[PDB]
Design a protein that fits this description.
Chain E: This is Large ribosomal subunit protein bL27. The structure is cut from a larger assembly and holds chains A, B, C, D and E. Chain B has one domain. Helix content of chain B is about 30%, strand content about 10%. Chain B contains four helices and four strands. A four-stranded antiparallel sheet of chain B has the order 2-1-4-3. In chain C, strands 2-1-4-3 form a four-stranded antiparallel sheet, with no helix packed on it. Helices cover about 0% and strands about 45% of the residues of chain C. Chain C is mainly beta. The chains are: A alpha+beta, B alpha+beta, C mainly beta, D alpha+beta, E mainly beta. Bound molecules: zinc ion. The structure holds three RNA strands.
Chain lengths: ~140, ~180, ~50, ~120, ~80
RNA sequence: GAUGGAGGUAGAGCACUGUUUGGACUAGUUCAGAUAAACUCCGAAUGCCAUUCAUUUAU
RNA sequence: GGCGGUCGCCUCCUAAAAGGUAACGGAGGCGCCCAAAGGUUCCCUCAGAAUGGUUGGAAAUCAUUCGAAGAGUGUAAAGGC
RNA sequence: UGUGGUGGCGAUAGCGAGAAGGAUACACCUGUUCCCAUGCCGAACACAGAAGUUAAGCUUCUUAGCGCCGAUUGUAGUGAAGGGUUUCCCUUUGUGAGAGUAGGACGUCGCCACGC
């Protein structure tokens, strides 16, 4: 599980995703991408589950870029406790993802291994996805 | 006094030719001489800056400044403004007399004649000597001394490239290796 | 240690002013030249013993 | 080492003198320049941005001494010349110097021959 | 069981007269902390940075060089 | 409706402070990519304050 | 309801770009101190880094060169300088 | 015209690299007797000067590497008016950025003095 070292604030607000990605919508470092087409929260455990599945399938390695980091914490109260007093205790970490964001990148491996690995990563996740390659600019090798 | 003649009569023609100076303003000089004492022991015994100052003033006709803390570090039991060391600055004739007594009387009292290192030029043309004790001078005495301590020296000049000062400094004395 | 105080005139004896001081810092009595309104003049005022 | 020029160090003090001193046409601004061999003086109003009178150290005809005595003559000259233009109520800008030496000489000579400060 | 729960009274800071409004002597123009805005022709500063008119005239918010603002009052 | 103005939100940005991924490097700085409620080099729509102003209206 | 906490005052976020705005919402301070740490007149410019230097070490104190602020501002934070 | 001084205007006025120049003026430079000064030092500030020099400041001129001033049209947002599940999304009408760019830019306006 990824965790931020040293937060400045222990609790915070949650909202208000209102989808459209602000940042990385193109492949930057690899050859193949996994782009989210819905907007949702994505947690520590979902990322690690997807990463383990993606790497296990690629015997002889290759490389993998995780491009999504959980910055924002949770809180929650307990069963049997009435409404009222201040926020609960923090339990978890998440990152909000909006539609358009590329989330993983793979390279050093032909199509079918990369496509199978990105297929296995998506069943571990709560979003709809596409698979994209680097298309066309002044230079794309 | 002793070296203004020496400048305008041996050295300025030399240095003006060796680097082909179109003007004589271009020829470097000696601006300052600054002496330092790092006592660091008024921490313990208040009567240490006193001896440092007595010795430094035995050297030159000038009561030295007093340098204080400038911050507070607990490694050395330092608050702010704890008077630590003394310093002196030398202009004009106080500089030429002091350079002469450095080259011609005092320095060679030091043995194991390593003179002056040459990794000692700042990279911009000023030089800093080094002294371990006080007994190297004819202004000091035998018995009065009680500690092995010596003084730092810095000689500042008006030179761009180190070697210009190397020559302008050896030419007046300072017996380098 | 800090205590309110009154300064009293030294010619007409009128307590004209109220002020402060720290009495472990200033152990003795304050002394100021202040305008005295009864005489319309600047006079040496002193703190009440 | 790098010795700085003095003229910039005194521009840095002159800009702080001028946050208070300023000159209108009722109360023009008596300025001063002091160089290595002279001292000058102008009488300046600022809403219009112009000079009303002037006098210079060794430009026109002052001499009869070359100690601080050159300054008092300039003070007397601007006093007479500005009284010629109906001027009595100036304000004194030191430049960035001290009110002490040969600027005090010019100022004093101004105060004897017609200009109320 | 919380240890928060306290605040101070709001202070009603801001602009108290508009650009282009005529104003009588002594009327407040702007309440602030520190000089966000500066005093200009015929305007004073108080002890806690409030800006006030000295003379009757119209109010004009202007620009002070590159990055500062000014208030002036101009009589007819 | 027209004209002037005060102010930092919705964007989006990484100059400042937190949080953060790759690569080159070395002392023994750099090239890229993200992020924020108590971050800001920037910055709307609308609302608000005015005016010897205009057109309708009756407060 | 009880038990627990809270009860006046200051600064920030919430607060939807004027002002105002709830909650047993999220974070901190106050119940003083200074005879100069107040007034006024002159003068001054910071924190670091790199290079050399005896004790002296990473780091006390000296010298030079870069350095718009990365310091300081009696005390919390914001706005200022 | 050239140079000294003193002013307005958002650095389009700045920074760095490069050249040249002493006619007067500006400077560096030379000294401490006398007014004044160093928490040590005539370094500075203060004064007396006029041997020396354009090396440094200063002035003029070249340079778009760093800063600065930047449109247009496209997007993101959002006044009004409507529609699906209402977490969110869409269609008309009006407004319209921040980025990213084409371009600008090595100042411009004025008073005084002296010299040509
Ligand atoms: Zn009385």
């Amino acid at each position: 599980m990824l965790v931020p070292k040293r937060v400045k604030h222990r609790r915070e607000f949650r909202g208000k995703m209102r989808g459209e990605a602000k940042g990385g919508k193109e492949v930057a470092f690899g050859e193949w991408g996994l782009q989210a087409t819905e907007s949702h929260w994505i947690t520590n455990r979902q990322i690690e589950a997807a990463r383990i599945a993606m790497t296990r399938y690629m015997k002889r390695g290759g490389k993998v870029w995780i491009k999504i980091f959980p910055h924002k914490s949770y809180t929650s109260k307990a069963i049997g406790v009435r409404m009222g007093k201040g926020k609960g205790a923090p339990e978890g970490w998440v990152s909000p993802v909006k539609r358009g964001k590329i989330m993983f990148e793979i390279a050093g491996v032909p199509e079918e291994v990369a496509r199978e690995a990105l297929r296995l990563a998506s069943h571990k996740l709560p979003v709809k996805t596409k698979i994209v390659k680097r298309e066309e600019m002044g230079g794309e090798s | 006094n002793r070296l203004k003649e020496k400048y305008i009569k041996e050295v300025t023609p030399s240095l003006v030719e060796k680097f082909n100076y179109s003007s004589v303003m271009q020829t470097p000089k000696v601006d300052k001489i600054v002496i330092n004492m790092g006592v660091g022991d008024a921490v313990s015994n208040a009567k240490n800056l006193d001896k440092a100052v007595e010795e430094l003033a035995l050297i030159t006709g000038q009561k030295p400044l007093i340098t204080k803390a400038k911050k507070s570090i607990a490694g050395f039991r330092l608050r702010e403004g704890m008077p630590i060391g003394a310093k002196v600055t030398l202009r004009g004739e106080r500089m030429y007399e002091f350079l002469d007594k450095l080259v011609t009387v005092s320095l060679p009292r030091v043995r194991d004649f390593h003179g002056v290192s040459k990794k000692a030029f700042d990279g911009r043309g000023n030089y800093t000597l080094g002294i371990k004790e006080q007994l190297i001078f004819p202004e000091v005495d035998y018995d009065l001394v009680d500690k092995v301590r010596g003084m730092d020296i810095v000689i500042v000049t008006t030179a761009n490239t180190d070697e210009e000062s190397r020559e302008l400094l050896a030419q007046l004395g300072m017996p380098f290796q | 240690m800090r205590v309110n105080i009154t300064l009293e005139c030294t010619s007409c004896k009128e307590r004209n002013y109220l002020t402060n001081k720290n009495k472990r810092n200033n152990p003795d009595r304050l002394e100021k030249q202040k305008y005295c309104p009864r005489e319309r003049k600047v006079t040496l005022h002193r703190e009440t013993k | 080492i790098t010795k700085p020029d003095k003229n910039k160090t005194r521009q840095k003090r002159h800009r702080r003198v001028r946050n208070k001193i300023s000159g209108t046409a009722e109360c023009p601004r008596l300025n001063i320049f002091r160089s290595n061999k002279n001292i000058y003086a102008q009488v300046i109003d600022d809403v219009a941005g112009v000079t009303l009178a002037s006098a210079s150290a060794l430009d026109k005809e002052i001499s009869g001494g070359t100690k601080t005595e050159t300054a008092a003559a300039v003070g007397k000259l601007v006093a007479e010349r500005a009284a010629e233009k109906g001027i009595k109520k100036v304000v004194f800008d030191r430049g960035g110097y001290l009110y002490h030496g040969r600027v005090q000489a010019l100022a004093e000579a101004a105060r004897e021959n017609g200009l109320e400060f | 069981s919380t240890s928060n729960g306290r605040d101070s009274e709001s202070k009603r800071l801001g602009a108290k007269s508009a650009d282009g409004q005529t104003v009588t002597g002594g009327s407040i123009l702007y309440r602030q902390r520190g000089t966000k805005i500066y005093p200009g022709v015929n305007v004073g500063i108080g002890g806690d940075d409030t800006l006030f008119a000295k003379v009757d005239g119209v109010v004009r918010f202007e620009r002070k060089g590159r990055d500062k603002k000014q208030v002036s009052v101009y009589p007819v």
